[PDB]
Amino acid sequence: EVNSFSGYLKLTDNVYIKNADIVEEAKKVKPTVVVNAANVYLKHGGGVAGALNKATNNAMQVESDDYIATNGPLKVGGSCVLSGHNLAKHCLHVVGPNVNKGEDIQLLKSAYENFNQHEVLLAPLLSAGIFGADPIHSLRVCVDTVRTNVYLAVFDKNLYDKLVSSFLE
Amino acid sequence: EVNSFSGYLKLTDNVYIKNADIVEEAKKVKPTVVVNAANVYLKHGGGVAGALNKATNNAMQVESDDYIATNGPLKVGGSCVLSGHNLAKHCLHVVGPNVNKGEDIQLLKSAYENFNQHEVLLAPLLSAGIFGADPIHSLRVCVDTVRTNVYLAVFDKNLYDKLVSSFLE
Numbered sequence A, B: 001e002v003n004s005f006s007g008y009l010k011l012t013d014n015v016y017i018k019n020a021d022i023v024e025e026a027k028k029v030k031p032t033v034v035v036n037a038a039n040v041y042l043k044h045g046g047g048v049a050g051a052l053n054k055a056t057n058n059a060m061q062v063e064s065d066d067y068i069a070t071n072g073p074l075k076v077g078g079s080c081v082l083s084g085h086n087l088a089k090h091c092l093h094v095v096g097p098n099v100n101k102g103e104d105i106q107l108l109k110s111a112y113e114n115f116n117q118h119e120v121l122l123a124p125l126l127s128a129g130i131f132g133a134d135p136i137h138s139l140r141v142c143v144d145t146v147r148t149n150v151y152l153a154v155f156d157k158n159l160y161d162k163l164v165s166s167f168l169e
Protein backbone atom coordinates (compact mmCIF):
# COMPACT_ATOMS: atom_id res chain seq x y z
CA GLU A 1 0.00 0.00 0.00
CA VAL A 2 1.15 3.52 -0.84
CA ASN A 3 2.71 6.06 1.50
CA SER A 4 3.49 3.43 4.15
CA PHE A 5 5.87 5.58 6.18
CA SER A 6 7.09 3.76 9.29
CA GLY A 7 9.17 4.85 12.24
CA TYR A 8 9.24 8.58 11.52
CA LEU A 9 9.57 11.20 14.26
CA LYS A 10 7.23 14.18 14.18
CA LEU A 11 9.08 17.50 14.26
CA THR A 12 6.12 19.74 13.40
CA ASP A 13 2.53 19.00 12.43
CA ASN A 14 3.60 18.42 8.80
CA VAL A 15 7.34 17.56 8.95
CA TYR A 16 8.63 14.13 9.99
CA ILE A 17 12.16 12.68 10.04
CA LYS A 18 13.90 9.30 10.05
CA ASN A 19 17.49 8.07 10.08
CA ALA A 20 17.27 6.02 6.90
CA ASP A 21 18.44 5.45 3.33
CA ILE A 22 16.00 7.25 1.00
CA VAL A 23 16.27 4.51 -1.66
CA GLU A 24 15.38 1.78 0.84
CA GLU A 25 12.56 3.98 2.13
CA ALA A 26 11.16 4.55 -1.35
CA LYS A 27 11.13 0.81 -2.06
CA LYS A 28 9.32 0.01 1.21
CA VAL A 29 7.05 3.07 1.51
CA LYS A 30 5.89 3.23 -2.13
CA PRO A 31 5.43 7.01 -1.88
CA THR A 32 3.33 9.05 -4.25
CA VAL A 33 6.32 11.41 -4.57
CA VAL A 34 10.03 11.00 -3.96
CA VAL A 35 12.14 14.17 -4.11
CA ASN A 36 15.49 14.20 -5.86
CA ALA A 37 18.27 16.63 -4.87
CA ALA A 38 18.96 17.60 -8.47
CA ASN A 39 21.19 19.95 -10.41
CA VAL A 40 19.98 22.18 -13.24
CA TYR A 41 21.03 19.68 -15.95
CA LEU A 42 19.41 16.69 -14.20
CA LYS A 43 22.74 14.85 -14.32
CA HIS A 44 22.37 12.27 -11.58
CA GLY A 45 26.03 11.64 -10.93
CA GLY A 46 26.32 11.29 -7.16
CA GLY A 47 24.61 11.68 -3.83
CA VAL A 48 20.88 11.08 -3.60
CA ALA A 49 20.46 11.68 -7.33
CA GLY A 50 22.96 8.99 -8.28
CA ALA A 51 21.47 6.55 -5.77
CA LEU A 52 17.91 7.11 -7.01
CA ASN A 53 19.03 6.82 -10.62
CA LYS A 54 20.95 3.60 -10.01
CA ALA A 55 17.92 2.12 -8.23
CA THR A 56 15.86 2.86 -11.38
CA ASN A 57 18.45 0.97 -13.46
CA ASN A 58 19.35 4.27 -15.17
CA ALA A 59 15.80 4.83 -16.48
CA MET A 60 15.66 8.10 -14.53
CA GLN A 61 18.73 9.45 -16.33
CA VAL A 62 17.41 8.48 -19.77
CA GLU A 63 14.10 10.23 -19.03
CA SER A 64 15.87 13.25 -17.54
CA ASP A 65 18.05 13.70 -20.62
CA ASP A 66 14.93 13.64 -22.78
CA TYR A 67 13.34 16.29 -20.53
CA ILE A 68 16.41 18.55 -20.79
CA ALA A 69 16.30 18.15 -24.58
CA THR A 70 12.87 19.83 -24.47
CA ASN A 71 13.31 22.20 -21.49
CA GLY A 72 16.93 23.25 -21.31
CA PRO A 73 18.37 23.55 -17.80
CA LEU A 74 16.11 24.06 -14.82
CA LYS A 75 16.26 27.27 -12.80
CA VAL A 76 17.97 27.34 -9.41
CA GLY A 77 15.07 27.07 -6.97
CA GLY A 78 12.98 25.32 -9.61
CA SER A 79 11.84 21.76 -10.15
CA CYS A 80 10.21 19.36 -12.54
CA VAL A 81 7.87 16.40 -12.08
CA LEU A 82 9.00 13.24 -13.88
CA SER A 83 8.27 9.54 -13.45
CA GLY A 84 8.98 7.88 -10.14
CA HIS A 85 9.96 4.71 -12.02
CA ASN A 86 10.14 1.73 -9.63
CA LEU A 87 10.55 3.99 -6.57
CA ALA A 88 7.41 6.16 -6.45
CA LYS A 89 4.53 7.32 -8.59
CA HIS A 90 6.37 10.60 -9.32
CA CYS A 91 9.85 12.03 -8.82
CA LEU A 92 9.99 15.74 -8.01
CA HIS A 93 13.47 16.86 -9.10
CA VAL A 94 14.29 20.00 -7.10
CA VAL A 95 17.31 22.28 -7.58
CA GLY A 96 18.48 23.96 -4.42
CA PRO A 97 21.18 26.64 -4.60
CA ASN A 98 24.80 25.52 -4.56
CA VAL A 99 26.39 28.10 -2.29
CA ASN A 100 29.82 26.72 -3.14
CA LYS A 101 29.50 28.08 -6.67
CA GLY A 102 28.17 31.42 -5.54
CA GLU A 103 24.44 30.75 -5.76
CA ASP A 104 21.96 32.54 -3.50
CA ILE A 105 21.03 30.57 -0.38
CA GLN A 106 17.69 32.41 -0.25
CA LEU A 107 16.59 30.34 -3.24
CA LEU A 108 16.41 27.37 -0.86
CA LYS A 109 12.98 28.80 0.04
CA SER A 110 11.96 28.64 -3.63
CA ALA A 111 13.29 25.08 -3.82
CA TYR A 112 11.19 23.88 -0.89
CA GLU A 113 8.12 25.83 -2.07
CA ASN A 114 7.83 23.26 -4.88
CA PHE A 115 6.89 20.65 -2.26
CA ASN A 116 3.54 22.47 -1.74
CA GLN A 117 2.29 21.10 -5.08
CA HIS A 118 2.30 17.58 -3.57
CA GLU A 119 0.20 16.42 -0.63
CA VAL A 120 2.84 14.02 0.76
CA LEU A 121 6.52 13.58 -0.11
CA LEU A 122 9.51 11.42 0.79
CA ALA A 123 12.49 13.77 0.59
CA PRO A 124 16.12 14.47 1.48
CA LEU A 125 17.37 17.75 2.84
CA LEU A 126 18.24 20.14 0.02
CA SER A 127 21.36 22.26 -0.58
CA ALA A 128 23.58 20.66 2.08
CA GLY A 129 26.56 18.42 1.40
CA ILE A 130 28.24 19.45 -1.84
CA PHE A 131 25.84 22.41 -2.14
CA GLY A 132 27.26 23.98 1.00
CA ALA A 133 24.23 24.91 3.12
CA ASP A 134 24.12 23.94 6.76
CA PRO A 135 21.74 20.97 7.23
CA ILE A 136 20.21 22.62 10.32
CA HIS A 137 19.35 25.66 8.20
CA SER A 138 17.97 23.50 5.40
CA LEU A 139 15.66 21.72 7.86
CA ARG A 140 14.49 25.11 9.14
CA VAL A 141 13.73 26.40 5.64
CA CYS A 142 11.79 23.19 5.00
CA VAL A 143 9.80 23.58 8.21
CA ASP A 144 9.07 27.25 7.50
CA THR A 145 8.18 26.84 3.80
CA VAL A 146 6.55 23.44 3.26
CA ARG A 147 2.94 23.15 4.41
CA THR A 148 2.15 19.75 2.83
CA ASN A 149 3.32 16.55 4.54
CA VAL A 150 7.04 15.87 4.26
CA TYR A 151 8.88 12.75 5.41
CA LEU A 152 12.61 13.49 5.53
CA ALA A 153 15.24 10.76 5.32
CA VAL A 154 18.70 11.47 6.75
CA PHE A 155 21.30 8.78 6.06
CA ASP A 156 24.03 9.81 8.53
CA LYS A 157 23.33 8.98 12.18
CA ASN A 158 25.46 11.70 13.74
CA LEU A 159 23.83 14.32 11.52
CA TYR A 160 20.36 12.92 12.24
CA ASP A 161 21.05 13.15 15.98
CA LYS A 162 22.29 16.73 15.63
CA LEU A 163 19.21 17.71 13.61
CA VAL A 164 16.75 16.13 16.04
CA SER A 165 18.41 17.19 19.29
CA SER A 166 18.88 20.78 18.15
CA PHE A 167 15.30 20.94 16.86
CA LEU A 168 13.41 19.42 19.79
CA GLU A 169 15.54 19.84 22.93
CA GLU B 1 0.55 14.12 28.73
CA VAL B 2 1.24 10.49 29.60
CA ASN B 3 2.53 7.77 27.28
CA SER B 4 3.68 10.28 24.65
CA PHE B 5 5.83 7.86 22.67
CA SER B 6 7.33 9.51 19.60
CA GLY B 7 9.32 8.17 16.69
CA TYR B 8 8.92 4.46 17.40
CA LEU B 9 8.99 1.82 14.67
CA LYS B 10 6.30 -0.86 14.69
CA LEU B 11 7.74 -4.38 14.65
CA THR B 12 4.51 -6.24 15.44
CA ASP B 13 1.02 -5.06 16.34
CA ASN B 14 2.07 -4.62 19.99
CA VAL B 15 5.89 -4.22 19.92
CA TYR B 16 7.61 -0.97 18.91
CA ILE B 17 11.28 0.03 18.94
CA LYS B 18 13.42 3.18 18.98
CA ASN B 19 17.14 3.96 19.03
CA ALA B 20 17.10 6.03 22.20
CA ASP B 21 18.25 6.46 25.80
CA ILE B 22 15.56 4.98 28.07
CA VAL B 23 16.10 7.66 30.74
CA GLU B 24 15.61 10.48 28.23
CA GLU B 25 12.58 8.64 26.87
CA ALA B 26 11.04 8.25 30.32
CA LYS B 27 11.45 11.96 31.04
CA LYS B 28 9.82 12.97 27.72
CA VAL B 29 7.20 10.21 27.38
CA LYS B 30 5.95 10.20 30.98
CA PRO B 31 5.04 6.50 30.72
CA THR B 32 2.65 4.74 33.05
CA VAL B 33 5.33 2.03 33.42
CA VAL B 34 9.08 1.99 32.90
CA VAL B 35 10.78 -1.42 33.09
CA ASN B 36 14.06 -1.85 34.91
CA ALA B 37 16.54 -4.61 33.98
CA ALA B 38 17.03 -5.65 37.59
CA ASN B 39 18.91 -8.26 39.57
CA VAL B 40 17.38 -10.31 42.37
CA TYR B 41 18.67 -7.96 45.11
CA LEU B 42 17.46 -4.79 43.33
CA LYS B 43 20.99 -3.37 43.53
CA HIS B 44 21.00 -0.77 40.79
CA GLY B 45 24.72 -0.59 40.21
CA GLY B 46 25.13 -0.28 36.45
CA GLY B 47 23.46 -0.46 33.08
CA VAL B 48 19.83 0.58 32.77
CA ALA B 49 19.27 0.04 36.49
CA GLY B 50 22.05 2.41 37.50
CA ALA B 51 20.93 5.00 34.96
CA LEU B 52 17.30 4.89 36.13
CA ASN B 53 18.36 5.04 39.76
CA LYS B 54 20.68 8.01 39.19
CA ALA B 55 17.89 9.84 37.35
CA THR B 56 15.69 9.36 40.45
CA ASN B 57 18.44 10.93 42.59
CA ASN B 58 18.89 7.54 44.32
CA ALA B 59 15.27 7.42 45.55
CA MET B 60 14.78 4.19 43.59
CA GLN B 61 17.63 2.48 45.46
CA VAL B 62 16.36 3.60 48.87
CA GLU B 63 12.88 2.27 48.05
CA SER B 64 14.29 -0.94 46.60
CA ASP B 65 16.33 -1.65 49.73
CA ASP B 66 13.20 -1.21 51.82
CA TYR B 67 11.35 -3.65 49.52
CA ILE B 68 14.12 -6.26 49.85
CA ALA B 69 13.97 -5.85 53.64
CA THR B 70 10.36 -7.10 53.45
CA ASN B 71 10.58 -9.51 50.48
CA GLY B 72 14.05 -11.00 50.38
CA PRO B 73 15.51 -11.47 46.90
CA LEU B 74 13.28 -11.71 43.87
CA LYS B 75 13.08 -14.91 41.85
CA VAL B 76 14.84 -15.20 38.50
CA GLY B 77 12.05 -14.57 35.99
CA GLY B 78 10.14 -12.58 38.59
CA SER B 79 9.42 -8.91 39.11
CA CYS B 80 8.04 -6.32 41.47
CA VAL B 81 6.09 -3.10 40.96
CA LEU B 82 7.56 -0.10 42.79
CA SER B 83 7.30 3.66 42.35
CA GLY B 84 8.28 5.21 39.06
CA HIS B 85 9.59 8.25 40.96
CA ASN B 86 10.19 11.18 38.58
CA LEU B 87 10.38 8.88 35.53
CA ALA B 88 7.01 7.11 35.33
CA LYS B 89 3.97 6.31 37.41
CA HIS B 90 5.37 2.84 38.17
CA CYS B 91 8.66 0.99 37.75
CA LEU B 92 8.37 -2.71 36.94
CA HIS B 93 11.66 -4.24 38.10
CA VAL B 94 12.14 -7.46 36.12
CA VAL B 95 14.84 -10.09 36.66
CA GLY B 96 15.87 -11.91 33.53
CA PRO B 97 18.22 -14.90 33.76
CA ASN B 98 21.94 -14.23 33.80
CA VAL B 99 23.26 -16.99 31.56
CA ASN B 100 26.82 -16.03 32.49
CA LYS B 101 26.25 -17.34 36.01
CA GLY B 102 24.55 -20.50 34.85
CA GLU B 103 20.92 -19.37 34.99
CA ASP B 104 18.29 -20.85 32.67
CA ILE B 105 17.68 -18.79 29.53
CA GLN B 106 14.15 -20.21 29.33
CA LEU B 107 13.24 -18.01 32.30
CA LEU B 108 13.47 -15.05 29.92
CA LYS B 109 9.92 -16.05 28.94
CA SER B 110 8.84 -15.76 32.58
CA ALA B 111 10.59 -12.39 32.81
CA TYR B 112 8.72 -10.95 29.83
CA GLU B 113 5.41 -12.50 30.95
CA ASN B 114 5.38 -9.92 33.75
CA PHE B 115 4.82 -7.22 31.12
CA ASN B 116 1.29 -8.61 30.52
CA GLN B 117 0.14 -7.10 33.84
CA HIS B 118 0.60 -3.61 32.33
CA GLU B 119 -1.27 -2.20 29.35
CA VAL B 120 1.67 -0.14 28.02
CA LEU B 121 5.36 -0.16 28.97
CA LEU B 122 8.61 1.62 28.13
CA ALA B 123 11.28 -1.07 28.39
CA PRO B 124 14.81 -2.21 27.59
CA LEU B 125 15.68 -5.62 26.25
CA LEU B 126 16.20 -8.09 29.09
CA SER B 127 19.02 -10.57 29.76
CA ALA B 128 21.47 -9.27 27.14
CA GLY B 129 24.68 -7.40 27.89
CA ILE B 130 26.16 -8.63 31.16
CA PHE B 131 23.41 -11.27 31.41
CA GLY B 132 24.70 -13.01 28.29
CA ALA B 133 21.63 -13.56 26.11
CA ASP B 134 21.71 -12.60 22.47
CA PRO B 135 19.72 -9.36 21.95
CA ILE B 136 18.07 -10.81 18.83
CA HIS B 137 16.80 -13.73 20.92
CA SER B 138 15.64 -11.40 23.69
CA LEU B 139 13.62 -9.36 21.19
CA ARG B 140 12.07 -12.58 19.88
CA VAL B 141 11.08 -13.77 23.36
CA CYS B 142 9.53 -10.34 23.97
CA VAL B 143 7.58 -10.49 20.71
CA ASP B 144 6.39 -14.05 21.39
CA THR B 145 5.47 -13.52 25.08
CA VAL B 146 4.26 -9.95 25.58
CA ARG B 147 0.74 -9.22 24.36
CA THR B 148 0.34 -5.75 25.92
CA ASN B 149 1.93 -2.72 24.25
CA VAL B 150 5.69 -2.49 24.61
CA TYR B 151 7.93 0.37 23.50
CA LEU B 152 11.54 -0.82 23.46
CA ALA B 153 14.48 1.58 23.74
CA VAL B 154 17.86 0.44 22.38
CA PHE B 155 20.75 2.80 23.13
CA ASP B 156 23.38 1.44 20.72
CA LYS B 157 22.87 2.35 17.06
CA ASN B 158 24.69 -0.62 15.54
CA LEU B 159 22.71 -3.01 17.72
CA TYR B 160 19.45 -1.20 16.92
CA ASP B 161 20.19 -1.52 13.20
CA LYS B 162 20.97 -5.22 13.57
CA LEU B 163 17.75 -5.82 15.52
CA VAL B 164 15.55 -3.95 13.04
CA SER B 165 17.14 -5.21 9.83
CA SER B 166 17.14 -8.83 10.97
CA PHE B 167 13.54 -8.56 12.18
CA LEU B 168 11.92 -6.82 9.22
CA GLU B 169 14.05 -7.50 6.12
Ligand SMILES: [Cl-]
Pocket: A008, A009, A010, B005, B006, B007, B008
Ligand atom coordinates in the same frame (compact mmCIF):
# COMPACT_ATOMS: atom_id res chain seq x y z
CL1 LIG C 1 6.45 11.08 16.29
Ligand SMILES: [Cl-]
Pocket: A005, A006, A007, A008, B008, B009, B010
Ligand atom coordinates in the same frame (compact mmCIF):
# COMPACT_ATOMS: atom_id res chain seq x y z
CL1 LIG D 1 5.95 2.32 12.58
